[PDB]
Amino acid sequence: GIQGLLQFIKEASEPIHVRKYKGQVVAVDTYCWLHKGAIACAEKLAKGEPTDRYVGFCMKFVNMLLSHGIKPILVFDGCTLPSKKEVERSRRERRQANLLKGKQLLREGKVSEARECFTRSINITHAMAHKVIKAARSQGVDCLVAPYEADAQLAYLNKAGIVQAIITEDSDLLAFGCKKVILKMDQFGNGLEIDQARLGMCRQLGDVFTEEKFRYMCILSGCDYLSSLRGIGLAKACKVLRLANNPDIVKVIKKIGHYLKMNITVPEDYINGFIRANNTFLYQLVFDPIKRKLIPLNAYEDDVDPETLSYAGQYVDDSIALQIALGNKDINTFEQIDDYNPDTALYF
DNA sequence: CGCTAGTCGACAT
DNA sequence: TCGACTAGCG
Ligand code: NA
Helix, strand or coil, rough: CCHHHHHHHHEEEEEEEEEHHHHEEEEEHHHHHHHHHCCCCCCHHHHHHCCCCCHHHHHHHHHHHCCCCEEEEEECCCCCHHHHHHHHHHHHHHHHHHHHHHHHHHCCCCCHHHHHHHHHCCCHHHHHHHHHHHHHHHHHHHHCCCCCCHHHHHHHHHHHCCCCCEECCCCCHCCCCCCCEECCCCCCEEEEEEHHHHHHHHHCCCCCCCHHHHHHHHHHHCCCCCCCCCCCCCCHHHHHHCCCCCCHHHHHHHHHHCCCCCCCCCCHHHHHHHHHHHHHHHHHHHEECCCEEEECCCCCCCCCCCCHHHHHCCCCHHHHHHHHHCCCCCCCCCCCCCCCCCCCCCCC
16 A cells, blocks of 8 residues: 555554444454454465364454444455556465465475465455354444445545544555544554544644645555656655645646656656546545445546546446445355345444 | 665464 | 565665
């Protein structure tokens, strides 16, 4: 995600405990729990051997949140966004290597170094995620599989008032316009919360605490959607936005060499890349739990054209979207693997 | 100072 | 995966 964002705005953070959300609703990026739980049993998962330690690992977190009187909404990743469809695969292959290498590193005796090999080959499948989903439903905990990336979905759940805070390890949530993000939370409840409103507590941030400018900064610094121009980090991007008296971001990016007083040349496809990135942060498709409909993260502004935003996710039928969201329909094969019905007993 | 890429540890015995 | 941390260079 946004490389080095947390340290950049550490002044806006605060050590908290989950009890401050007792009697309120919190959405969870379940992937972090799934991964941290999968580390404990990477060996069995790599060899294909049966294991389910990650289920219990997630469930102790769930039971903790429930013990402190909090209503958790588990959120999962869905279809891979086209913008990263290569990237993920570019990661995928590497995992395979760390499998083929890893096992061979066990043939040389080095099990200590094979640890890092098998732990860097972990692939969180939809099956494992669904096992966790069943394990959560058995405890009466609502779940929700995002149409695509879970970040946008969580951001929506928080900006809609459905949840008050979001538990995750990804800082990208901030660039999506999240209000309250709880980072680094152990199995006991000790966490680190960052609020959007308190982004002004960061001196080096300047006046770049507004959501739009902050987003521009995050994108310009380098993200999953668009690699940053070489030599551009959070600081110099922030400086560009501070020295800019211009609302139109395109002309500003074209004048980056003027704002940084450097010889920076901007490729004309990088402009389009920035536009696509911004449109992805703004209008990535998410699922509305209440209205049961595929909607963009934010309402389409008048200046944008929804017909040209396929890279931000494609629309499907709202019923199918519902079946995906409930985790009944497989992300890949589009086949029914379950039949949960919330009616016959999040979705008001 | 600031940015890149690269290593490194996570879990837990 | 994803942040943390650092050497190396503009
Ligand atoms: Na960068």
